[PDB]
Each structure stands twice: as structure tokens, then as C-alpha cells.
Write a protein that binds this ligand. Structure first.
Ligand SMILES: [Zn+2]
Lengths: 306, 301
């Protein structure tokens, strides 16, 4: 038992981190098969990081103005034999295919989804932690200057899912980056201007998952015969900065395991948001909305009598 | 900026995980050089083990009573050519030396210290999280039945420091284990008994580091000119479930950078213990004590 922010083992991602240099600039990159991915402001120097134009900066470059080095494990080497710009990423083709490429895919997480981040500095993996895409499509990470190109991922059934490359800090403890199609989460632009982030909401279905985790771990005082129907819950949510609740198989597995109905949980969320009345749920006195139903199921994984 | 629970990358440790099978069913093991470490309660059944004698449990079995497999990466079966017992650990020798043994050392953490954990099942790495050795030398982690033999570590300069092998769960969300010299943290034992488990306290130097992190992330409302001397604070701390404060360099680095003195933070602790009164610090309403000065230095620099 217990519930902690848990990350996927970073081993398979570590073997793919490289360093990418362009002029005075050096960032982290991701080496998969014959391709190296890194943020495109690699081409921007000390000068124009404010409000540059990348289109001009790109044609200015050649397959040689990029050098790629691997500074961990099996060393490298690596010759850029082609280069392109995909959104806010730069896509490099290299002569050698990464021998340690894991089975993988690219996808884009939706708000409320969690993933693991391998934080990197100077091409060295430095830390692992879990975040989730907030309702305003930012993450609340821990990054410092030099950490761009750091890699967000999940792992499911042998497949590494690469979903995030770190780009920037929007404000205190608030970060964003892009998926590997080079779309920036939240549509922020990669220039150093004031860009405002939208409001952000508690993710209801994650709060519900959390409450089910509590119950399974012996905390159940917030559970009453009181119920709020989904449609009613959802009307209240639109005025109280909560996301709308939509049912899922994963939540229904938890309702079934605990014998506590979803609509009891939504009522609990209404009460608790008004105040924990000086009590605690798994140590917290505020609502935790960053464990997903899948995250909860993986840590309260059990045998089911059928 | 930002402050989160961060773990050391686990790849070098993943390379060392193996599955050990005895008589019967399996635990996780750590494969370093020609050695494999794993909890000793693996020479064990499932019916009775309440008051066992490990003496004979050891001599009763022999060499290939143990099957050791590497399931991830390069798959191997690893012959066991020798075995012995250190404390609550089992120290096997195997004919093949792990070619991916990282530079490593063994140590024992003190209460208040934090380390990374690679949770494992069937010799397979599943999750990584960070924990903190509580005052009563337990940890609050996330472990399920087949997780025993899971490995706690820290990393420095390319050296893996192995500090923890998971042994059992005590209460709920309450777990414990041993260092690699076979000594159990908290001096608990391979037994199904509700052992007393000491009283647990807030780790003061860690709360201080956390308050420093808060200031460095734009949150500083709790800072007053009000000071409290260290000696005066320790007195108060015994009557109030807190650990004694002992200045270190990591802290001074934070005091310096923020220009806020340790005595201010101590004073702030007394104020906030009583309660936060509607106000939050770094999204929390309670005094977080599981980030160490080093953690904070690492994340804020
Ligand atoms: Zn950068």
C-alpha cells in the first residue's frame, strides 16, 4: 500500500539523450534511430532570444553547423547528414542509427494526463519526476536554465511513449514544451515575451481517483450516503473551477472494488472543496488532482474475484 | 524554478536488477560483479514463518536451490556457485560477473535523509520514487506484495550509492528494509509481528530547507524580522514533536542566497506549527519535511 508520485524507469530514455551544439549554443537532444530532436532556439544566440525569426535563421544553417555528441554510456560521434524544422523543434538526420533505440511512438497528452520527465543538463540525465498537463496546458515542473530538450514520456506494454520536449519557463514553477510534432503545449511561442497563461482548474476525475485511493488505504470519513448526480456535479463545476466529470472504465473498476459510487465521490468533492473541516486525506488538507485513474490503479493493483 | 519530488535516474540500477527464485516463488535481487543480494526471507514458505530459525533455512538449502534470472535487457540464467548470510540479507555468488556493474558504494542513511527507490516486481523495474527515512527509521513509500528486494539508492559523480533493500511493510504506507550490511533500519526484524515502531517527528532542518525553497520561488509572507535562537528552539522542539536543529553548510548557502537567517526560519516554524490560518506555502497548508537542504540546493541551485 501507499500512494506516491511515481515515475516510469528512465533507463531506456537515458540511452537516447545527446548534446546538440550550434555555434555558442548547446542543448539536450533526443536520439532515436537516425534522428535527433532538439528545440529550434538552438539556432538563436545570446542576441535575439527575445523575439527572433527562425525562418531566416534556418536557411542560414548547414548540416555542418550542427554537431551532435553523446556523453554517456556508448560514446559518439554522429554526423548530421540532413536538417529540418518541425514547429518549434529542429529535426536532424544522422549517419548512425542509435543502437539503443527502444520500441516507441510519439503522442500528445491531453490536459489531466500525467507523464514522467527525465530532466537533463549538458546532455547528462540529472533527475526523474512526474508531472501532469494542467487544464491550461502547462506543467508544474522543476527546471533550470540549461534544461531545455529534457524529455517527458510514459511507458506501457513495452512501448515508450514520447510526449514532451521541454522548451521554457512561463512564470514561477510553470513550464511548457512541445510534443514531437513540434506543437507547443498551450500554443505558447518560443520567444521571450510576455505570454499569458489561462486560468487552470482542478481535474475532477483525478480527484475522484485520489479519493478512491484514500478509501483503499483506510481513509473513508468523507464518504456519506450523500450523492450528487453527474449532470448536477457538472453544472457546479463550471462555476467552481473544476473540469467536467466524464465516466471511464478505470474509475468504474475503483467504484466496484470499493463499493463506493461515483456520485458519492462527487458529493465528497463538493463538501471537501468547502473545507476539510480540520481533517486530512492521505496527509493532505487540500484536494490532490495529479494522480490519474490509471496511476491509482497501478499502485492499488489487485486480484479481482469474479 | 519550481520544487518537486525528484529522483536520481535509474538506468544504472535497472542494469543490476534480477529475479531470485527459491523454494518457492521469487523476490528481486541486486547483481553487482559476481554477487547477488536479496532478502533472506526468500528461503521461506508462506504458511508459517512467525518465529523461524534462519540458521538452518540457510544450511537446509544449497547452491542451485536458488534460480537467478535477468529478465530485462540481455537475458541470462546465472549459475549460483556459493551462498551465505549477512544479517537479514542473502549473499549469493554467481559464475558470471555483471558486465554492467556501475561504480558504486554502500552506505547507511540517517533519519531525515532522502533517497531514490526503484520498485521492482519479478526482477522487472516498474516505478521510481523518492522517499525519506522518517525519525523512527521507516519510509512512506508505495510497495505491493512482490516488491521485496526493491532497491534504494542515491547518485553522486557517477557513483551509485546503494543504501536500501526493501524487506517488509509494517503498518500501512509504512515500510522498512535494510542496508547492504544486512542491518535493518529501525532495528526491526524478519517477523510477522506488530513491532512497536517509535514515535516519529518533523525533521527541522528539512522544514527549514523547504521554507528557503519557498522564498526562492516567490513565496515569502511567512518571513518576519522575528528571530529565535537555536538553543531556545531545540528546547521548544522536544515539547513539540520536532527534531533538534544542527547547522550545516548546505543551509548556510541558502541563508546567504536569500539573506534570510536560520533564526528567522526557526521562528517561522513555531508560528506555522500552530497552523497556517487560511494561507498556503508552495501549494501546501502543512509543514513539508521531506526535502533536504541538498535536494533544495540541487533544484534551485
Ligand atoms: Zn535552451
Amino acid at each position: 500500500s501507499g500512494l506516491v508520485k511515481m515515475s516510469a524507469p528512465s533507463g531506456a530514455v537515458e540511452n537516447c539523450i545527446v548534446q546538440v551544439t550550434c555555434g555558442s549554443m548547446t542543448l539536450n537532444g533526443l536520439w532515436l534511430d537516425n534522428t535527433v530532436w532538439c528545440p529550434r532556439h538552438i539556432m538563436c544566440p545570446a542576441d535575439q532570444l527575445t523575439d527572433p525569426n527562425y525562418d531566416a535563421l534556418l536557411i542560414s544553417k548547414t548540416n555542418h553547423s550542427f554537431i551532435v555528441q553523446k556523453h554517456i554510456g556508448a560514446q559518439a560521434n554522429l554526423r548530421v547528414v540532413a536538417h529540418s524544422m518541425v514547429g518549434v523543434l529542429l529535426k536532424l538526420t544522422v549517419d548512425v542509427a542509435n543502437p539503443s533505440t527502444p520500441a516507441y511512438t510519439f503522442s500528445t497528452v491531453k490536459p489531466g494526463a500525467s507523464f514522467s520527465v527525465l530532466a537533463c543538463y549538458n546532455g547528462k540525465p540529472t533527475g526523474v519526476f512526474t508531472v501532469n498537463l494542467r487544464h491550461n496546458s502547462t506543467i508544474k515542473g522543476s527546471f533550470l536554465c540549461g534544461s531545455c530538450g529534457s524529455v517527458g514520456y510514459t511507458e506501457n506494454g513495452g512501448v515508450i511513449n514520447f510526449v514532451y520536449m521541454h522548451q521554457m519557463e512561463l512564470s514561477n514553477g510553470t513550464h511548457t514544451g512541445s510534443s514531437f510534432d513540434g506543437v507547443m503545449y498551450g500554443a505558447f511561442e518560443d520567444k521571450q515575451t510576455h505570454q499569458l497563461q489561462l486560468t487552470d482548474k482542478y481535474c475532477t476525475i483525478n480527484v475522484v481517483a485520489w479519493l478512491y485511493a484514500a478509501v483503499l488505504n483506510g481513509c473513508k470519513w468523507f464518504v456519506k450516503p450523500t450523492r450528487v448526480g453527474i449532470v448536477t456535479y457538472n453544472e457546479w463545476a463550471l462555476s467552481n473551477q473544476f473540469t467536467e466529470f466524464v465516466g471511464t472504465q478505470s474509475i468504474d473498476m475503483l467504484a466496484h472494488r470499493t463499493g463506493v459510487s461515483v456520485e458519492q465521490m462527487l458529493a465528497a468533492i463538493q463538501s471537501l472543496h468547502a473545507g476539510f473541516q480540520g481533517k486530512t486525506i492521505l496527509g493532505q488538507s487540500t484536494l490532490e488532482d495529479e494522480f490519474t485513474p490509471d496511476d491509482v490503479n497501478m499502485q492499488v493493483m489487485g486480484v479481482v474475484m469474479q
